[PDB]
Coordinates of C-alpha atoms and ligand atoms in Angstrom, one line a residue:
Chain A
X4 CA 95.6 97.6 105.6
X5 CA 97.7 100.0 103.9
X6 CA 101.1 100.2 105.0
X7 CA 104.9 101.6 103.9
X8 CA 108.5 100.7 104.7
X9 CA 111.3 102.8 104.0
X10 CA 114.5 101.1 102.4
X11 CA 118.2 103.2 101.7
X12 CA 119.8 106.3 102.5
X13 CA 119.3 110.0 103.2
X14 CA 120.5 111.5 100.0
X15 CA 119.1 112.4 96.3
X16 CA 115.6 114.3 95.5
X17 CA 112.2 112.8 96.2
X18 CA 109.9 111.2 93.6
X19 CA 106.4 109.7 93.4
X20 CA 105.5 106.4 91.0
X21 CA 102.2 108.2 90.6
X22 CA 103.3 110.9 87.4
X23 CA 100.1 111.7 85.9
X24 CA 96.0 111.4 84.4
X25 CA 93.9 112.0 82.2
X26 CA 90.8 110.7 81.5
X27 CA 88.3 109.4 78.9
X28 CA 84.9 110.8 79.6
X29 CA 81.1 111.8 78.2
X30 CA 78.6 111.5 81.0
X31 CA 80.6 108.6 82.7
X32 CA 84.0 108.2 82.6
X33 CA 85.1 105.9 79.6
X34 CA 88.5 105.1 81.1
X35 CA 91.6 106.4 82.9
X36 CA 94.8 106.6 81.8
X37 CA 97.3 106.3 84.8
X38 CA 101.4 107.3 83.3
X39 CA 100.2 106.8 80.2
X40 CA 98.3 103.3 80.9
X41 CA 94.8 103.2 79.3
X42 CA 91.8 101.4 82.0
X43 CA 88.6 101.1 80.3
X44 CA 86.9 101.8 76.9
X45 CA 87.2 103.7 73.5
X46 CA 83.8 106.1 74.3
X47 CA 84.1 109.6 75.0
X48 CA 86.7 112.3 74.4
X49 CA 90.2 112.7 75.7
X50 CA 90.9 115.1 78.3
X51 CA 94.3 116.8 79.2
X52 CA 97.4 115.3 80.6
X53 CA 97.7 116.4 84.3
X54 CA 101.6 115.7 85.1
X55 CA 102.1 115.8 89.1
X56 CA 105.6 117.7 89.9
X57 CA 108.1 116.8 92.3
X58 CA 106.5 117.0 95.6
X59 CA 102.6 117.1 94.5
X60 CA 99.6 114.9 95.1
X61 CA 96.0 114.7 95.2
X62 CA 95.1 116.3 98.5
X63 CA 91.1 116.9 98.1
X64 CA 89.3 115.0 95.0
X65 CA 85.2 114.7 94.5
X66 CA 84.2 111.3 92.6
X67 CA 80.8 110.9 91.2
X68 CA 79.6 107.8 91.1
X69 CA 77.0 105.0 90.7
X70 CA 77.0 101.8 89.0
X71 CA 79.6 103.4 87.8
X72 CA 82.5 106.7 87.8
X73 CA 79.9 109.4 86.7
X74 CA 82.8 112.4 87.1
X75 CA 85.9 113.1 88.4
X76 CA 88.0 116.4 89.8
X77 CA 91.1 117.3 91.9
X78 CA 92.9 119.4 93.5
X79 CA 96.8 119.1 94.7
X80 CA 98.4 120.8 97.7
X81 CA 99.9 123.1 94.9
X82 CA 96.4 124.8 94.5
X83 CA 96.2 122.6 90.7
X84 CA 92.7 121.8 89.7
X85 CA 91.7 118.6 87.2
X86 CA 88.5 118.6 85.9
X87 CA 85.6 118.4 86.4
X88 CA 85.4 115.8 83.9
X89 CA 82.0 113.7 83.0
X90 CA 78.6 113.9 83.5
X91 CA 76.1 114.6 86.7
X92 CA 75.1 111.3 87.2
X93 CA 75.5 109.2 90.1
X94 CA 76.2 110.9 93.7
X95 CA 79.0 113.1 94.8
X96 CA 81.7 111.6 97.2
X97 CA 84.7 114.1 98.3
X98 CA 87.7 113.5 99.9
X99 CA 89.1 116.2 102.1
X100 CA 92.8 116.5 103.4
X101 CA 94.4 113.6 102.1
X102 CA 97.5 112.7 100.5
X103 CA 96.6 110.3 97.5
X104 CA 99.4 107.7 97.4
X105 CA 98.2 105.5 94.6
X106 CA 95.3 105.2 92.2
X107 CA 93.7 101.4 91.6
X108 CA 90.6 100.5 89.9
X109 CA 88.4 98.3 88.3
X110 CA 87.4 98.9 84.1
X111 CA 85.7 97.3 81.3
X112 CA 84.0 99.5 78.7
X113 CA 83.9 102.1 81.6
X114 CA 85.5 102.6 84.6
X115 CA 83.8 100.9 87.4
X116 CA 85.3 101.6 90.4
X117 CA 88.3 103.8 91.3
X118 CA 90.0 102.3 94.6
X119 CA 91.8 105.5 95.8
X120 CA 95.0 104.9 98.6
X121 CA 95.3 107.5 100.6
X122 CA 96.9 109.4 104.2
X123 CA 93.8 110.7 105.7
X124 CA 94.7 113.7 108.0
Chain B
X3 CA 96.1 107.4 108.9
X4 CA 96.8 105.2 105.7
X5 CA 93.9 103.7 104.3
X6 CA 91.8 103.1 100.9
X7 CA 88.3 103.4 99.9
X8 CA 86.4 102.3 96.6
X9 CA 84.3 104.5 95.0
X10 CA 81.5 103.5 92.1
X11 CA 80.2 99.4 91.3
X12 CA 80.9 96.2 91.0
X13 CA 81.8 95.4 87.6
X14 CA 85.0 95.7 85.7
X15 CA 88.5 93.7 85.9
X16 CA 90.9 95.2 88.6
X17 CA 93.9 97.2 87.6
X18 CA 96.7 98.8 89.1
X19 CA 98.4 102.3 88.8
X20 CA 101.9 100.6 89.4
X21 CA 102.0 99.1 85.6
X22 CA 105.6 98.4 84.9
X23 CA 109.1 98.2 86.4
X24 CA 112.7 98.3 85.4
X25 CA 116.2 99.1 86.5
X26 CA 119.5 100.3 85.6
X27 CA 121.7 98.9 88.1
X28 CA 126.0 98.1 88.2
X29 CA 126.9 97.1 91.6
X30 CA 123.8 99.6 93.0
X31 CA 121.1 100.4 91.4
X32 CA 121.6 103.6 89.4
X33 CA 117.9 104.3 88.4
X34 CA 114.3 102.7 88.8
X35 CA 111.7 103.1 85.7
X36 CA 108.3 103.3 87.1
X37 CA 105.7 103.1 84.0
X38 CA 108.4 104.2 82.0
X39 CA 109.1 107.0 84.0
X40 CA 113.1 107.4 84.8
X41 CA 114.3 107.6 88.2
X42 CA 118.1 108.2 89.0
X43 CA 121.4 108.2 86.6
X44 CA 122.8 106.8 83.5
X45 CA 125.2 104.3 85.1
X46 CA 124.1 100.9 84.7
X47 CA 123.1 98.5 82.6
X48 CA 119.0 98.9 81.9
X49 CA 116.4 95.5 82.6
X50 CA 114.2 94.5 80.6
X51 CA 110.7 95.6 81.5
X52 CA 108.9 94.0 84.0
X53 CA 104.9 94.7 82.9
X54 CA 102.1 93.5 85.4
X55 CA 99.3 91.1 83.8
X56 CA 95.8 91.5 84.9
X57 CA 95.1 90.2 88.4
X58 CA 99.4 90.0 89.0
X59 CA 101.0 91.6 91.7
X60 CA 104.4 92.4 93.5
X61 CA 104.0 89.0 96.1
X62 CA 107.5 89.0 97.9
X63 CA 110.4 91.3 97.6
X64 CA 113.8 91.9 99.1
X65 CA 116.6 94.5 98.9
X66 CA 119.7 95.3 99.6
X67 CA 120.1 98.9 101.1
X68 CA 123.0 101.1 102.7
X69 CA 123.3 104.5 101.8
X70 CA 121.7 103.3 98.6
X71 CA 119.5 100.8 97.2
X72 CA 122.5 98.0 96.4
X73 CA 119.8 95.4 94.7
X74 CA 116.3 94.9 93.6
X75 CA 114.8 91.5 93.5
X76 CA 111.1 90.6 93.4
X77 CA 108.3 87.8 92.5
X78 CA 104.4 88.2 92.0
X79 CA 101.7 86.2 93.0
X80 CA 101.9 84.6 89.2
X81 CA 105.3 83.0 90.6
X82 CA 107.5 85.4 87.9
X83 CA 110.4 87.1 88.9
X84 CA 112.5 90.3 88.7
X85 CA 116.1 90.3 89.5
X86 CA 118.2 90.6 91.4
X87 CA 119.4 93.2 89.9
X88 CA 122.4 95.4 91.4
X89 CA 125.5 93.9 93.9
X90 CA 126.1 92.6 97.2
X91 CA 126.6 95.2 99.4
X92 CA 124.3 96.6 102.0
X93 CA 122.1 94.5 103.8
X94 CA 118.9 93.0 102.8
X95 CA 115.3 93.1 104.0
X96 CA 112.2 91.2 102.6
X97 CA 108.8 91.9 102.6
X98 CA 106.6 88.6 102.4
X99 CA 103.0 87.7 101.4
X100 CA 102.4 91.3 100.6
X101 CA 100.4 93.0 97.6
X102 CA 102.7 95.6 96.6
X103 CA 100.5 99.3 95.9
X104 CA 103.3 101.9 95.4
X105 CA 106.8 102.9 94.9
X106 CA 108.0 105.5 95.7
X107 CA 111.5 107.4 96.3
X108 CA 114.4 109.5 96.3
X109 CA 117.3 109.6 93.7
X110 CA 120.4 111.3 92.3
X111 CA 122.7 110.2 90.2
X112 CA 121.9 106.3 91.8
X113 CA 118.5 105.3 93.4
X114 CA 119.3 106.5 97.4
X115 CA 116.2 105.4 98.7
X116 CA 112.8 103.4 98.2
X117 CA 109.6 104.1 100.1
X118 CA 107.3 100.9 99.4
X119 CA 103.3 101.2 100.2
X120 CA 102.0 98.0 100.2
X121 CA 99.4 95.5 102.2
X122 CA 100.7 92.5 104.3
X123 CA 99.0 89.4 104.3
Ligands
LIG8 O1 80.8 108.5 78.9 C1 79.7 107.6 78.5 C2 79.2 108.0 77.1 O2 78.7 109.3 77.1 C3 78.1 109.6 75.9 O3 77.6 110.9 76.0 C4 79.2 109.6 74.8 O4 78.5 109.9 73.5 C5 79.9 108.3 74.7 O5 81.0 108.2 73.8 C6 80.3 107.8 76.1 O6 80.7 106.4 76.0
LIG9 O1 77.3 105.5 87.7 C1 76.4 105.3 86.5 C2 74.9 105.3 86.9 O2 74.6 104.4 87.9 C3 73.2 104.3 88.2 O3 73.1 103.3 89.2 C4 72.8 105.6 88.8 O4 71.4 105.5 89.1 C5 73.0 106.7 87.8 O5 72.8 108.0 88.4 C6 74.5 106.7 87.4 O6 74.7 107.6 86.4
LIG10 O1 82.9 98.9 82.4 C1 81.5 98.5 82.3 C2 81.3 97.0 82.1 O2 82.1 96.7 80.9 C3 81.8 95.3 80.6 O3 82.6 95.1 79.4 C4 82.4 94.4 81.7 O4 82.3 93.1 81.3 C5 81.6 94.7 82.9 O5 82.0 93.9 84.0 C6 81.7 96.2 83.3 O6 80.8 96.5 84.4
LIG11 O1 125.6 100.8 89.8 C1 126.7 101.6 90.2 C2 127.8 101.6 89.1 O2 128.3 100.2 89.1 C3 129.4 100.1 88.2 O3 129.8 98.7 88.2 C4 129.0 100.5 86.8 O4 130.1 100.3 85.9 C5 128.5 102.0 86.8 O5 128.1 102.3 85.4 C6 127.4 102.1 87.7 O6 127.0 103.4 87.7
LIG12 O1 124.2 101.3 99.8 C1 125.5 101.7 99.4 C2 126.5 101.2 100.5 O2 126.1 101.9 101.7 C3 127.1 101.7 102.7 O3 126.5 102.4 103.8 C4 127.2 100.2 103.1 O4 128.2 100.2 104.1 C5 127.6 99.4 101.8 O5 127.6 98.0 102.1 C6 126.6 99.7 100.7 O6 127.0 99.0 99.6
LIG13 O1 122.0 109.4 94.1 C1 123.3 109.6 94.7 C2 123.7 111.0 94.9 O2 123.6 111.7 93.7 C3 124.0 113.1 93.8 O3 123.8 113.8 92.6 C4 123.0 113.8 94.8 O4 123.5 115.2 95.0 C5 123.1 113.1 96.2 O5 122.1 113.7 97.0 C6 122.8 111.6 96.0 O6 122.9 110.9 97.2

């Protein structure tokens, strides 16, 4: 189970470890590429950088997948959109009013599996 | 409610969106580097960076905290460690036999405040 402990004071200006994505993609995606960290393989192209400002997250996301992640897209509580990037394989999975916390995974020449952390409200 | 959920197969090798760590710390810590991303002020003296191997993950931790973050220490599940870095004032807390997920925070001109999502085992 997911849980959080606070540690320090009041002061200074909020900031998330998350910072930003992009993706590899064709009709699966090839990899992601979490602050700058590549996970996965060399095929497709290279989408845009998404950069997540000061007080922004995920907060409704669709994920295509099967054996594999088919597509990805988001939107933040800020009304920014990423993607859709990929194909239209697989099946479509949304998440609705959340608050993505962290994005994990699993990748070898594709990415496999996105484990997604999350507030579900 | 916090939570996760894994979209896509079985395949792959598991990776993490937390990638790296490092600190500039004096007698607080004066900034925390997340992926290389800055957090905080100039004062300090900067770590070396801390980089996550495949499968390796923040284990135990404890910090010192006031009105800031004072120190940083931590180990992984490989049995490396981080720190401490920072001084002796506040009071410290551990978390133990955890699988650090996130870091996140608030910061100024030091590092006031850490909020740490995580799963305890
Ligand atoms: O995304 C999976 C694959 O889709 C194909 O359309 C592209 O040509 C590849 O480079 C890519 O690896
Ligand atoms: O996720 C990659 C592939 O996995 C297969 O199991 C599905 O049948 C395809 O629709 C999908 O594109
Ligand atoms: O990412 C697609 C695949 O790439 C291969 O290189 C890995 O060994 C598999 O476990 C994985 O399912
Ligand atoms: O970490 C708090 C402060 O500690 C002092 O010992 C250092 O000289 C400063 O550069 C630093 O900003
Ligand atoms: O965290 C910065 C400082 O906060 C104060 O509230 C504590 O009394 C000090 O011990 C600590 O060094
Ligand atoms: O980070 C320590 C301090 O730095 C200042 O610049 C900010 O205004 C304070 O909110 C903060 O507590």
């Amino acid at each position: 189970s997911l849980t959080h402990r606070k540690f320090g004071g009041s002061g200074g200006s909020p900031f998330s470890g998350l910072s930003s994505i992009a993706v590899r993609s064709g009709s699966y995606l090839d990899a992601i590429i979490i602050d700058g960290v590549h996970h996965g393989g060399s095929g497709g192209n290279l989408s845009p950088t998404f950069t997540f400002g000061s007080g922004e997250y995920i907060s409704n996301m669709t994920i295509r997948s099967g054996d594999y992640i088919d597509n990805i897209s988001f939107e933040t509580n800020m009304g920014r959109r990423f993607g859709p990037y990929g194909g239209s394989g697989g099946s479509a999975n949304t998440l609705s009013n959340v608050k993505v916390i962290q994005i994990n995974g699993s990748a070898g020449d594709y990415l496999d599996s996105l484990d997604i952390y999350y507030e579900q409200y």
